[PDB]
Design a protein around this motif. Structure first.
Motif, mmCIF file in Angstrom:
data_model
loop_
_atom_site.group_PDB
_atom_site.id
_atom_site.type_symbol
_atom_site.label_atom_id
_atom_site.label_comp_id
_atom_site.label_asym_id
_atom_site.label_seq_id
_atom_site.Cartn_x
_atom_site.Cartn_y
_atom_site.Cartn_z
ATOM 1 N N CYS A 128 -2.178 -4.203 6.255
ATOM 2 C CA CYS A 128 -2.938 -4.416 5.045
ATOM 3 C C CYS A 128 -3.143 -5.908 4.817
ATOM 4 O O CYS A 128 -2.261 -6.598 4.310
ATOM 5 N N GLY B 135 0.815 -1.191 0.000
ATOM 6 C CA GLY B 135 0.000 0.000 0.000
ATOM 7 C C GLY B 135 0.854 1.247 0.000
ATOM 8 O O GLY B 135 1.892 1.282 -0.664
ATOM 9 N N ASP C 121 -0.655 8.694 2.470
ATOM 10 C CA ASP C 121 -1.091 9.848 1.696
ATOM 11 C C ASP C 121 -0.847 11.145 2.453
ATOM 12 O O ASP C 121 -1.394 11.366 3.533
ATOM 13 N N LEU D 83 -7.563 -2.763 4.893
ATOM 14 C CA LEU D 83 -6.958 -2.062 6.013
ATOM 15 C C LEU D 83 -7.483 -2.554 7.339
ATOM 16 O O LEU D 83 -8.632 -2.313 7.716
ATOM 17 N N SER E 234 -3.583 3.941 2.501
ATOM 18 C CA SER E 234 -4.208 3.238 1.387
ATOM 19 C C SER E 234 -3.380 2.028 0.979
ATOM 20 O O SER E 234 -2.228 2.164 0.569
ATOM 21 N N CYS E 235 -3.969 0.843 1.104
ATOM 22 C CA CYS E 235 -3.255 -0.390 0.812
ATOM 23 C C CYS E 235 -3.168 -0.623 -0.689
ATOM 24 O O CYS E 235 -3.817 0.064 -1.477
ATOM 25 N N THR F 296 -7.398 4.073 9.183
ATOM 26 C CA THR F 296 -7.450 4.790 7.916
ATOM 27 C C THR F 296 -7.013 6.240 8.086
ATOM 28 O O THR F 296 -7.512 7.130 7.397
ATOM 29 N N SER G 215 -3.783 9.621 5.399
ATOM 30 C CA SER G 215 -4.719 8.525 5.187
ATOM 31 C C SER G 215 -4.018 7.334 4.548
ATOM 32 O O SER G 215 -3.347 7.467 3.525
#
Length: 129
Positions: free
Chosen positions: A126, A78, A81, A102, A95-96, A106, A93
């Motif tokens: 993840c 992942g 961000d 997840l 993100s996988c 998050t 945040s």
């Protein structure tokens, strides 16, 4: 009749030690400075706010700078961000990659107002399900 008043104030600096009492300082006191959460001093030198002669406390340069959050690092399977900056009081945040779910969080927060530049929740997971 006079005595030293509310001590000197620097760009982000504020007295550390209970040298103060901050009531009436008689002229002739060397005090020490503390930078606020998410600041760094100058190259760390004579930190001496003397109550000098004329209730005009001594030298006062710029014994602070800033310590912003140094990137929440990288998650896993992942990626993470950053909406364009990781300063103090920020957040991300997670993100996988593809196929993964997840299982940790998050998001995570940059906070400095506790234990200096640090983040709340490091690597989530993840987990492919």
């Amino acid at each position: 009749f006079r005595s030293c008043e509310v001590p000197t104030r620097l760009n982000s600096a504020s007295l550390k030690q209970p040298y103060i009492t901050q009531n009436y300082f008689p002229v002739g006191t060397v005090v020490e400075y503390e930078c606020r959460p998410g600041y760094r001093r100058e190259p760390s030198l004579s930190p001496k706010l003397t109550c000098l002669q004329n209730l005009k406390w001594s030298t006062a340069v710029e014994f602070c700078k800033k310590k912003s959050c140094p990137n929440p690092g990288e998650i896993r399977n992942g990626q993470i961000d950053v909406p364009g900056g990781i300063l103090f009081g920020a957040t991300i945040s997670f993100s996988c990659n593809t196929g993964y779910k997840l299982f940790g969080s998050t998001s995570s927060f940059c906070l400095i107002s506790g234990s200096s530049v640090q983040w709340s929740d490091p690597l989530p997971e993840c987990r492919e399900h």
